[PDB]
A paper describes a structure:
Amino acids (aa) required for protein synthesis are delivered to the ribosome by aminoacylated or “charged” tRNAs, activated forms of tRNAs wherein the 3′-end is conjugated with a cognate aa by specialized enzymes called aminoacyl-tRNA synthetases (AARS). In most organisms, LysRS belongs to the class IIb subfamily of AARS and is evolutionarily and structurally related to aspartyl-tRNA synthetase (AspRS) and asparaginyl-tRNA synthetase (AsnRS). In contrast to its bacterial counterpart, h-LysRS has a 70 aa N-terminal domain (NTD) that facilitates tRNA binding, but the structural basis of its role in aminoacylation remains unresolved.
In contrast, the conformational state of the LysRS–tRNALys3 complex in the AMPCPP dataset was exclusively in the “undocked” state. AMPCPP assumes a bent conformation in the LysRS active site, wherein the β- and γ-phosphate fold back toward the adenine base. Interestingly, H331 directly interacts with the β-phosphate of AMPCPP in the undocked state, and this same residue is involved in forming base-specific interactions with C75 of tRNALys3 in the docked state. Therefore, the docking of the 3′-CCA end of tRNALys3 cannot proceed until the lysyl–adenylate intermediate is formed and the cleaved pyrophosphate moiety is released from the active site.
Author numbering:
A (entry chain A): 72 to 577
B (entry chain B): 72 to 576
Write the structure that this text describes.
RNA sequence: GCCCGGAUAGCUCAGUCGGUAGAGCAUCAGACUUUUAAUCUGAGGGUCCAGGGUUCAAGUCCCUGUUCGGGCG
């Protein structure tokens, strides 16, 4: 009965504990790794038996074929590689020990094997064991699922099962670790200093993202989880550390969907005496070098709609394409839009609304010019942003805390990097004017309150730091999870997360 | 006066903004950093003037002094280095520009200087400016005083002021970052894989502490802040990743003092097919390497009650000492303590309490066996732990996640590294038995129901993961903040934290 | 809420027009000293989603109820 298998196995294990045959030994001295074993002894001719070499490996059994009463084949699997184990009685310690150990071994059990390298008559590298030791029995029936596990409910809720049964998961996570390591090395070589900013803030801020509210009993007050390390990074830049960076975890009290998580890892750096046009080249170098170092080339194949969907071949050649929002939008829509200075005026908002309705671009119930123009951009600019593209200048109406344009007016100093019709990186030229910063904070706090008592959603510590002099600096941020999704060919954020947050059962 | 100065400076800046003359320019191309400026143009002899080189640097005006109406020395400050912008009328663009820019710049203002490197008669490197541009005025008055500011509240609440006025803070933070960089390099070269475990868990667990409770809105469940990534790391090792590690943040809902913070960073790794004696050599190598790579030697001087206090000279020579927590306690105390290897009855607790009374020590009001024996070991085996020292094994009752000792009973496979009488890292041989782990979880839950706020709950997902088979593993955890405190001669956790949590005053 | 189609061993499907529960996979036992998704030999495992009427006899004729899935709101 498959349902009672666990119980039966448990009983057997209990018996092994009763009669002094503890199936959980404290230590097994593994001499060589499976990868090193395979690399070293792959040259052996078929039929070889290195009787003069003794090695101790360890791994989980993934198969068990009984070709006879004295000849059994196991398939150790570990470190992403497999190794056959040719349990033969004539090469074992004794026949009784052989049958005793082989009567207690099942699939999924973690065992240690001591024996001699060799190759079968079919040219399969294996290890003839002098003695097999049981290290950790598997009490649950491990399925023999050909083509791997495919149910996307035990894959995410039981990540260990996904790792055991599916091999691409390990590669997906190794790629993410390599991505983070490459970013760290790049920024450190550039001269940056990695910092750790508080994840719990007294104030939530004026941002629209919903925060996570905790309660500190010792200090008898509420604590808000981090949304961005923005303000503390800028306070450090005020202090004197010109170049800072942090790869950290931000929290958001929003919904859980295909491409969202309550907690996510983002990279953010800030450098003094620069601007967004200076960060353009740094972003080009970082992204192109990361792609070259991870995938081994500048071309990446991505499937936005699963393996059966369309395949897109993006090219990360270092000269990324750069386009301005206003000019490219003029070229795409054909018609010219009113001048930027009149972006705040209502007639601009209405002429944008009329033309977007003419193009059937659905917008949220708030019909402010910001929503309309960002929808226009997303519907007629990101559509063509398959290869990485640099949107070069955005209007001030979506962008607070960013300096005004050097020559233009009403346009913020920002760029965005779009790969596969999705933004991965953004950067801004900082607003170091304490008066303008305070005015924006007040306005956004009043907007966030939306008729409430207000007098909050601000950081008087930050507005006091800026009054001490913040050098003209530039900030850059990027989503780690989206980059990992684009580099591991995953269209779901849960595929690049070890333990994604899932809805509770029942 | 500071309010008056702020009012006057703000009025002046507003008047400047009215008639053009933006005091916040968008871009200033810094050609060479200050450190490179000192490194390169230091071979000059006093009285040299490289009129054929023009460089644009930037910094903050720490001090502005004038010697005559046509000669004024500013003291630029940058990445921990000090320049000296010696500005004069003859080599400036114009005299009118000279006195128009001299009456506007004050202390603390961030400026950019485009000029020729040189050296005066006295012999300190300077830059003769052709044009000075104000980049960011400092509205408030920087407190001008020697030795920096000593007000701990001001330094901790306003870290930017501490960085501006005090230089050793930058050194402390550089050292703290180098610690984490070296740990990552050491673990990566050993084959470990860096991972990111969730910071919010449905049920509390991971380590003995009190958690932070949140409330997800869309999904109606109550989330809990992380205390340790231990369980997730062990499930990942079950999955097949032999070696994992993570340098992350843990949250405690407890008090704040000189050594405790609500959020703190710790490094945890787990390696399969290893025991707690396989991590002692690794720990020796990692700690000695960190000390030698940062300090430059194996000898470190530490002041535990302030620099004015006595200095203790610890030595990090790789052969660290090794001590047994029960055997050496027996040797030093004098008498035979209760056997406790197979005796966990109330008699053991009572005789422990009698020993505590006889030894003149203070014990927690719960007076339980674990707390007692913890007081006994801490007060009798820790005074002579100046140099780094290992603790071979600890009784099982203070070990709900460590495998039992292979030879002795009641003891567990658990060592602890102590430097300067404080634990930095501790490692376990992890318990891979599902039945024993379930039993220990049940005891912890029963203790919590009995009124133990520091007990964990039972996690059935981890129990199932163990039921699927966990290899013989060893786990290791280290407190980064305490190590940074030791390596920076800092006796307060606030000194090694960028923005420590303080009273809402 | 209305209509339609399934409710069958542990899982996936036959069971045809009733003459009765079968096949594969999963588990257990046996055979085989060179397998690789090893292969053969069997065993257990259901009570046919539930209750009624037709029929000598109905999972396999029909009517209700429960659930799931799809469409229609
Ligand atoms: N749930 C989530 N998971 C991961 N990253 C998230 C996230 N929510 C926000 N972000 C970050 O925010 C960036 C831009 O999104 P934001 O405008 O800040 C919030 P959003 O509106 O929910 O996302 P969207 O604009 O991508 O639709 C992303 O690239 C990512 O870095
Ligand atoms: N609130 C906190 N702030 C900073 N570091 C903390 C901390 N709580 C624990 N740590 C660190 O976590 C590591 C292990 O701490 P523990 O030994 O579990 C503390 P404890 O013994 O439970 O309580 P105690 O610190 O009040 O004696 C050490 O590096 C310690 O400094
Ligand atoms: N936090 C910002 C940096 C720019 C800040 C501009 N005031 C980002 O990641 O985009
Ligand atoms: N990381 C835990 C325990 C370390 C040993 C884990 N096997 C702690 O510091 O408390
Ligand atoms: Mg956007
Ligand atoms: Mg982004
Ligand atoms: Mg301790
Ligand atoms: Mg510790
Ligand atoms: Na069969």
């Amino acid at each position: 009965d498959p349902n009672q298998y666990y119980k039966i196995r448990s009983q057997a294990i209990h018996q092994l504990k009763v009669n002094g045959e503890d199936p959980y030994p404290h230590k097994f001295h593994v001499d060589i790794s499976l990868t090193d074993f395979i690399q070293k002894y792959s040259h052996l001719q078929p039929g070889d038996h290195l009787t003069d070499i003794t090695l101790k490996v360890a791994g989980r059994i993934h198969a068990k074929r009984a070709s006879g009463g004295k000849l059994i084949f196991y398939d150790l699997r570990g470190e992403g590689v497999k190794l056959q184990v040719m349990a033969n009685s004539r090469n074992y310690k004794s026949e009784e020990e052989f049958i005793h150990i082989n009567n207690k071994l099942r699939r999924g059990d973690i065992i240690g094997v001591q024996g001699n390298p060799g190759k079968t008559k079919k040219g399969e590298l294996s290890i003839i064991p002098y003695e097999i030791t049981l290290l950790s029995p598997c009490l649950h029936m491990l399925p023999h699922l050909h083509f791997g596990l495919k149910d996307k409910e035990t894959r995410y809720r039981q990540r260990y099962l996904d790792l055991i049964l599916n091999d691409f998961v390990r590669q997906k996570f190794i790629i993410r670790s390599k991505i983070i390591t490459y970013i760290r090395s790049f920024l450190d070589e550039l001269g940056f200093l990695e910092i750790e900013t508080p994840m719990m803030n007294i104030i939530p801020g004026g941002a629209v993202a919903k925060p996570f509210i905790t309660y500190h009993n010792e200090l008898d007050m509420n604590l808000y989880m981090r949304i961005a390390p923005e303000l503390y990074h800028k306070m450090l830049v005020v202090g004197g550390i010109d170049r800072v960076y942090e790869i950290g975890r931000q929290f958001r009290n929003e919904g859980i969907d295909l491409t969202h998580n309550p907690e996510f890892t983002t990279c953010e750096f800030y450098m003094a005496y620069a601007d967004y046009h200076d960060l353009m080249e740094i972003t080009e170098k970082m992204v192109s070098g990361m792609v070259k170092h991870i995938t081994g080339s500048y071309k990446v194949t991505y499937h936005p709609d699963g393996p059966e969907g369309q395949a897109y071949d993006v090219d990360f050649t270092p000269p990324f394409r750069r386009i301005n929002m206003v000019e490219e939008l003029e070229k795409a829509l054909g018609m010219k839009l009113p001048e930027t200075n009149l972006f705040e005026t209502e007639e601009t908002r209405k002429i944008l609304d009329d033309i977007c309705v003419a193009k059937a671009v659905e917008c949220p119930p708030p019909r402010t010019t910001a929503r309309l123009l960002d929808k226009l951009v997303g519907e007629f600019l990101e559509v063509t942003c398959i290869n990485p593209t640099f949107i070069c200048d955005h209007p001030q109406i979506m962008s607070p805390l960013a300096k005004w344009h050097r020559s233009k007016e009403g346009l913020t100093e920002r760029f965005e990097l779009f790969v596969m019709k999705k933004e991965i990186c953004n950067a801004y030229t900082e607003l170091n004017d304490p008066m303008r910063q305070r005015q924006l904070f007040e306005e956004q706090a009043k907007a966030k309150a939306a008729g409430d008592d207000e007098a909050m959603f601000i950081d008087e510590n930050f507005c006091t730091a800026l009054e001490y002099g913040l050098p003209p600096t530039a900030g850059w941020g990027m989503g780690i999870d989206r980059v990992a999704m684009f580099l591991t060919d995953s269209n779901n954020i849960k595929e690049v997360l070890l333990f994604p947050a899932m809805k509770p059962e029942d």
